[PDB]
Amino acid sequence: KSPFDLAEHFMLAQGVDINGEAETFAPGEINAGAELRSKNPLISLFGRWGLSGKVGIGNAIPDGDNQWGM
Amino acid sequence: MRTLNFNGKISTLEPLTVTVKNAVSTSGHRLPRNGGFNAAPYFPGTSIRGTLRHAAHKVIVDRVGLNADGKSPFDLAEHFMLAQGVDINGEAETFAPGEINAGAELRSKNPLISLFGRWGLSGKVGIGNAIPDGDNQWGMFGGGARSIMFQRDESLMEFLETDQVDRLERLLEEQAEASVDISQIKTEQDALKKAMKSADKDTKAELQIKVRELDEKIQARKDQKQESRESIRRPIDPYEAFITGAELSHRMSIKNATDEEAGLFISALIRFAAEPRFGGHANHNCGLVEAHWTVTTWKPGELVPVTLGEIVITPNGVEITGDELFAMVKAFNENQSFDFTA
Amino acid sequence: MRTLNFNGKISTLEPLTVTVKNAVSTSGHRLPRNGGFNAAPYFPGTSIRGTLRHAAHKVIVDRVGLNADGKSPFDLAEHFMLAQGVDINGEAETFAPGEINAGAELRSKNPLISLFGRWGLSGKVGIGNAIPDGDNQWGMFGGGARSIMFQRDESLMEFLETDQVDRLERLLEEQAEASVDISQIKTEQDALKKAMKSADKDTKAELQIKVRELDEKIQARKDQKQESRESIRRPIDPYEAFITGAELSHRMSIKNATDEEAGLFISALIRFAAEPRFGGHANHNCGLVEAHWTVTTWKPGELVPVTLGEIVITPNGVEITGDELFAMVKAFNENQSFDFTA
DNA sequence: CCCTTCGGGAGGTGCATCCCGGTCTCGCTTGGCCTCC
DNA sequence: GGAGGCCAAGATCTCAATTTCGTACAAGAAATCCTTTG
């Protein structure tokens, strides 16, 4: 088993805080983003509700034509 | 003082989106539609202006130089004034109406404020809306659905203790029953919102009160949830965004642009090219753009303008043509008579 | 003398907006509609008239040039006479009230005061409104929201010192409390306004001396904010503009004008093409227009329009077509005996 | 210079978010006070 | 010492809340059709 709580699993992989507290404009969280990102590289990379995600994955678009079908 | 008109096109690398409070409504997320609901969406000039202003602010911060511990000499008020034109101190020197050469000194010593303006000081830089080219260059991007990680991959369950498995069971049961109740009350709310259209507006007020209390009851029901306040599994509402490869004609102007201010603007474009992002949903890499602009000056009294050069921003680099743009950039970089303090 | 009617269309290059006090209300910024909300807006001819008058005054300034000291020969009195026709020094030729063709000497000596009038001298240029040629050609442009720079880009915090970081946090806390106070005060104001539509004279007087005191309470609470008087995270209200590429029918004219006055008008239009901006919100590059004006005249005696030429302002240049337009332009360039100093 | 088949059958369900935060102005005249000539 | 400029102060009060174009058409000829067929 993993040490992480289930809420931590959800935070890391889906960015849902089931515990039920993640604000966005928390004034005290203005600078906690930096330390949170440093100590939580995954959450920094893939953001969460209230914290921007450093990683942005674009769409995959086919180069040529007729590259899709049923 | 030359009037530099940047005329060009913003090609889209990844879908371009923006959530404007005016355009978006409860019907969904819509791009700003130019005239009407059925009109062509446009990327606001406001978003482009803010992006370029923050890029220029970073340019000025780097030029002035961070202190040893990566901290710019500027205080908070200077940052806010430079990047949003908002003064938090209130000490920003308001130019009383009727002052001749109002802020000419501030313009000379603060090229950034001269370009992007302030409250009471006209901003030389006008960043226009990027209108699309062609009939269809937008669509409902994003979308999809948040899914329970453990119900998609069973391999993730070996990382959970028995107590956490029981917690997951509670979470899913709570989500299911709370969703049933929320869907029932939302069905009643939808019935009431369909009855909304009755001509009896005096009763529309009471129906609106009924909707408000129904939403309050929805909020209370969601608050009565120990495990998850919000439904974990839920479809993500798509956002309207310009398609990849969408060509958007774009126009900017700098009226009476001194070589210093013009050079600062070109440096702002250069720095923006590092992160050429315009708008939101950056989680899906939205905003990436490759833009090419032709700079044309127009001596007043002359029938035709003359093209100084071209600025092309691509993932492979920034190409600046014409000796004039290089001269302006060099003039801005060499001039040491700027004081962005106050 | 000739009457030159400039009948044409203004294609909007970037959204065209104007702020008019009557049109603007608390509900929002609306263009002058000449009726209810469900009506067709028109760009005022006053705004275009003032813009073209400013263009003509700049043309006159350039033609006159600067003194040996590098200062404009015009003083405040002459400058205001040429700009807005207000005789500040009380020294002006008080033409007879009933004699229509008065000031021929002044008209010949000052072609600008001839084209556009001064106070007491009828102007020769009639600048009509820009009327849209469609039923959906206007929209709520601009808008957006001012976002706190450090709440969007976390990297910008790496430049702030810890004292300034605490200042930012104090600013955000003050903004939050001011919002949660002003919103409640405005809710009380809204309840009082709701009670304003069922009141009698006595209670009306009692409950409107209360609304203004609630407004004073709002102002006092905003003043209590130590770090920022106004909330920075502000949602910008949109402004009503004409859509990009709006074909607005524009009707201009010059009445019984000498070739030199018409030449000054054409030169003013050419100079205006350097910065073809109408209206405000120049921060979003609003006002950029390209216009084609068929210049017609009236046949001697016959009520038939002859086409003397065309005036096509576009970002690529000004196209003057028609020999007589060139004749007027050169005639204005000639006749150096103009006297703008008296 | 033939002669082109039958029809089987057509989903079940999930779940649809939270929150900010809505500005200054000024459309007049006069005197007191400040420095300028 | 007078004569320009910049600022503050002066009475209480005016009413009004907005919602998305048009639908389907096709005649007598140099043509290239042509080139046949072979």
Spatial neighbors of B96 by CB under 8 A, at least 6 apart, are none
Over the range A24-38, which residues count as b (16 or more CB within 10 Å of their CB) and which as e? eeebebbbebeeebe
CB contact C86 to B (< 8 Å): no
> Which of B296, B125, B103, B269 has the alpha carbon at shortest distance from C281?
B125
What spatial distance separates the first Cα and last Cα of chain C, rounded to whole Å?
Answer: 24
**Chain C neighbors of B116, CB-CB under 8 A:** 283
Handedness of CA C165, C166, C171, C174 (dihedral sign): positive
Question: Which DSSP string corresponds to B76-102?
Answer: HHHHHHHHHS--SSS-S----TT-TTT
Cβ-nearest to B244 among A47, A55, A61: A61
CB A2 within 8 A of CB B159: yes
CB C143 within 8 A of CB B20: yes
CA distance linking residue C9 with residue C311, whole number of Å:
11
Query: To the nearest whole angstrom, how far is the Cα of B166 from the nearest Cα of chain C?
Result: 38
Residue that the structure tokens 């008020």 belong to: B77
Q: Which nucleotides of E are covered by protein (CB under 7 A)?
A: 7, 13-21
The DSSP code for C63 is H
C189 Cβ within 7 A of any nucleic strand D atom = no
Question: Which DSSP string corresponds to C83-117?
Answer: HH---SSS-S----SS-SS--HHHHHH-HHHHHS-
> Which of C223, C144, C214, C148 has the alpha carbon at shortest distance from C184?
C214
CA distance linking residue B132 with residue B16, whole number of Å:
11
Q: Which of A24, A30, A45, A54 to mutate to test the interface with C (most CBs of C within 10 A)?
A: A30
CA dihedral (C284, B142, B54, B127) in degrees, to 10, reads -20
CA atoms within 13 A on the CB side of C140: 18
Task: Assign C174 to helix, strand or coil.
Answer: helix
- Across the interface, whether the CB atoms of B284 and A56 are under 8 A apart is answered yes
The DSSP code for B218 is H
CA distance linking residue C175 with residue C35, whole number of Å:
39
CA distance linking residue B52 with residue B35, whole number of Å:
25
CB contact B288 to A (< 8 Å): yes
Q: Which nucleotides of D are covered by protein (CB under 7 A)?
A: 14-24, 26-27
Breaks (C-N over 2.5 A) in chain C follow: none
Question: Which DSSP string corresponds to C265-278?
Answer: HHHHHHHHTTS-B-
Residue that the structure tokens 């990102």 belong to: A37
CA dihedral (B313, B316, B317, B321) in degrees, to 10, reads -70
Structure tokens at B226: 């120990």
> Degrees (nearest 5) of the Cα angle B51, B55, B60?
145
| Nearest residue on chain A to C149, alpha-carbon basis | A30
CB contact A37 to C (< 8 Å): yes
Could you tell me how many residues make up chain A? 70
What spatial distance separates the first Cα and last Cα of chain A, rounded to whole Å?
Answer: 41
Cβ-nearest to A59 among B15, B156, B287: B15
CB C96 within 8 A of CB C114: no
Strand order in the sheet with B239-242: B16-17, B239-242, B138-141
Query: Of chain B residues 42-61, which have a CB less than 8 A from chain C?
Result: 42, 44-47, 49-50, 54, 57-58, 61
Residue that the structure tokens 């069971």 belong to: B169
The DSSP code for C237 is P
CA of C232 to C1' of E34 (A): 81
- B39 nearest nt, CA–C1': E20
What spatial distance separates the first Cα and last Cα of chain B, rounded to whole Å?
Answer: 25
CA of B122 to C1' of D14 (A): 54
Task: Assign B11 to helix, strand or coil.
Answer: strand
- Across the interface, whether the CB atoms of A34 and C158 are under 8 A apart is answered yes
φ, ψ of residue C329 in degrees (nearest 5): -65, -45
- Across the interface, whether the CB atoms of A27 and C165 are under 8 A apart is answered no
CA distance linking residue A27 with residue B272, whole number of Å:
28
- Across the interface, whether the CB atoms of C168 and A30 are under 8 A apart is answered yes
- Across the interface, whether the CB atoms of C151 and A30 are under 8 A apart is answered yes
CA distance linking residue C276 with residue C315, whole number of Å:
9
CA of C67 to C1' of D17 (A): 68
Q: Residue C52 belongs to what H/E stretch?
A: helix C45-64
C220 Cβ within 7 A of any nucleic strand D atom = no
**Spacing of C-alpha B15 from chain mean position:** 13
Cβ-nearest to B54 among C149, C161, C275: C149
CA distance linking residue B116 with residue B59, whole number of Å:
14
C231 Cβ within 7 A of any nucleic strand D atom = yes
What's chain A's Rg over C-alpha atoms?
17
Structure tokens at B329: 């950039």
Neighbouring chains of C at 3+ CB pairs under 8 Å are: A, B
